[PDB]
């Protein structure tokens, strides 16, 4: 079982790429579980065809405790038998994103979710704040292979660099590695070269450049992946290519985060 | 002294609006302090003309303890006498954003930084994650008047709703109240009407509509507010109008957060 996480800042299509990647993996007959850890995205919407899956935190509140919850309530099968669960974001103003994630992981462990013939687990994690709360899947030794979704944009590359700093902290004392950068295209001048340059400075790879395509939005609107919406689409082959490279990936490194001076010089050059 | 906070999702110019508002208040002769609590923005860059102000956490870590810091290391004067401090984001992968914010507040209090003849303090706070960490200004009873920056985009309005839920949690514990929505225009059709409609559902007001104007970006690239860069600009009068309405504001409410179904109804009605 390969224990993976996708990190990246919000507003650049990270969860869309995660779900289209996972759909592409299921299409190859890989048994995949998605654990949603992102309060700014619906991590399972495009797999389950559901506007917002009920979260572990929500249904522990509704039933009043977590030992009363049944796995059937929490873990739902969608496209290609992909198993979907949502941790549930922090209680507004009071909670920590880490509480939902710890609760989800402990519940899935207890209930046997991790020994049920899985090829991949993907934690879909928000990278807007690189705090201990959003590090929970790594802290719990539940994600060893990290892929970072970024774009040729200052804040997406800053987030990629800061996520890399977090990986080094848990890699100085354990098993977590960076598997690569995924570039979600923003239809930008030679954008691929910018993310390749960043990958080269970090000591990783740009594992795929995901193009901008109308078909992604068209599929999103119908609450599905491009893989399911339009399987013969050119964009469907883009996610298949990414999925094939993840499956075959051996390049799992301790990254070399860069200085703000280095990042600024990169951005100014491009 | 009026203790205010600006909350809002990242990537919509919240910190640009905060600094332009504060520069307009300083131009009017108001004595203002900005406390940066946003790891996705430089909260003081446009006031100090400096790319990244040294943060209290960075300087504390270096010096061993916060008690070894001098106030002048932390608190810098910029455009119009505006005093500027940055909390410093979480230690990547391990820290909590709340730690920098409590460290900054406690240091400023002890050093007499709030004893000065200030008219306003503005906490510039990220609203991407409405956790206990980012709620610290409210929890330490240090921000009473909340203004939410949003736009006519789904996730900006979702964040405004989530921030409102955080305010409700503390509304019976102290004088923390919502003063209004500030619309940072993204040139959406009927954007002003959409945010007026949202404010009315929440039980507040759209206190000001900030237009899209390239002079904002021309000032920002030169690390300035429009107020300093081009005080004769139409856009400078927009920030002056917002500043005067905040000064005169008497509408401070316990907001009424909406359901996702209510939010979706709004979005489709526009
Ligand atoms: S650790 Fe992160 S998510 Fe948890 S409260 Fe702190 S900032 Fe928020």
UniProtKB/Swiss-Prot annotation, chains A, B:
Outcome following mutation: residue 14 to Q/P: Loss of nitrogen fixation
Name by which UniProt lists this protein: Nitrogenase iron protein 1
Gene3D superfamilies: P-loop containing nucleotide triphosphate hydrolases
The reaction(s) this protein catalyses: N2 + 8 reduced [2Fe-2S]-[ferredoxin] + 16 ATP + 16 H2O = H2 + 8 oxidized [2Fe-2S]-[ferredoxin] + 2 NH4(+) + 16 ADP + 16 phosphate + 6 H(+)
Alphabetically ordered keywords of this record: 4Fe-4S, ADP-ribosylation, ATP-binding, Iron, Iron-sulfur, Metal-binding, Nitrogen fixation, Nucleotide-binding, Oxidoreductase
Family under the similarity heading: Belongs to the NifH/BchL/ChlL family.
Native source organism of the sequence: Azotobacter vinelandii
Protein induction: Constitutively expressed during log and stationary phase in sucrose-limited cultures, its levels decrease during stationary phase (at protein level).
Post-translational modification as stated in the protein's UniProt record: The reversible ADP-ribosylation of Arg-99 inactivates the nitrogenase reductase and regulates nitrogenase activity.
Gene transcribed to yield this protein: nifH1
């Amino acid at each position: 079982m390969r224990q993976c996480a996708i990190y990246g800042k919000g507003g650049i299509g990270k969860s869309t790429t995660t779900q289209n990647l996972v759909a592409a993996l299921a299409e190859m007959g890989k048994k995949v579980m998605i654990v949603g850890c992102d309060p700014k995205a619906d991590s399972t919407r495009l797999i389950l065809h559901s506007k917002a899956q009920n979260t572990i935190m929500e249904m522990a509140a509704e039933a009043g405790t977590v030992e009363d919850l049944e796995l059937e309530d929490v873990l739902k099968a969608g496209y290609g038998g992909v198993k979907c669960v949502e941790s549930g974001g922090p209680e507004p103003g009071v909670g920590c994103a880490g509480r939902g994630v710890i609760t989800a992981i402990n519940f899935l462990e207890e209930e046997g979710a991790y020994e049920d013939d899985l090829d991949f687990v993907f934690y879909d994690v928000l990278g807007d704040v690189v705090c201990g709360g959003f590090a929970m899947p790594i802290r719990e030794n539940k994600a060893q292979e990290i892929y970072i979704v970024c774009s040729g944009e200052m804040m997406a590359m800053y987030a990629a660099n800061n996520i890399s700093k977090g990986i080094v902290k848990y890699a100085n004392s354990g098993s977590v590695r960076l598997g690569g950068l995924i570039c979600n295209s923003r239809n930008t001048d030679r954008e691929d070269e910018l993310i390749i340059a960043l990958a080269n400075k970090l000591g990783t790879q740009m594992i795929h450049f995901v193009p901008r395509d109308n078909v992604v939005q068209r599929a999103e609107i119908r609450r599905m992946t491009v893989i399911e919406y339009d399987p013969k689409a050119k964009q469907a082959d883009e996610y298949r290519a990414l999925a094939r490279k993840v499956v075959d990936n051996k390049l799992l490194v301790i990254p070399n985060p860069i200085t703000m001076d280095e990042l600024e010089e990169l951005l100014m050059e491009f």
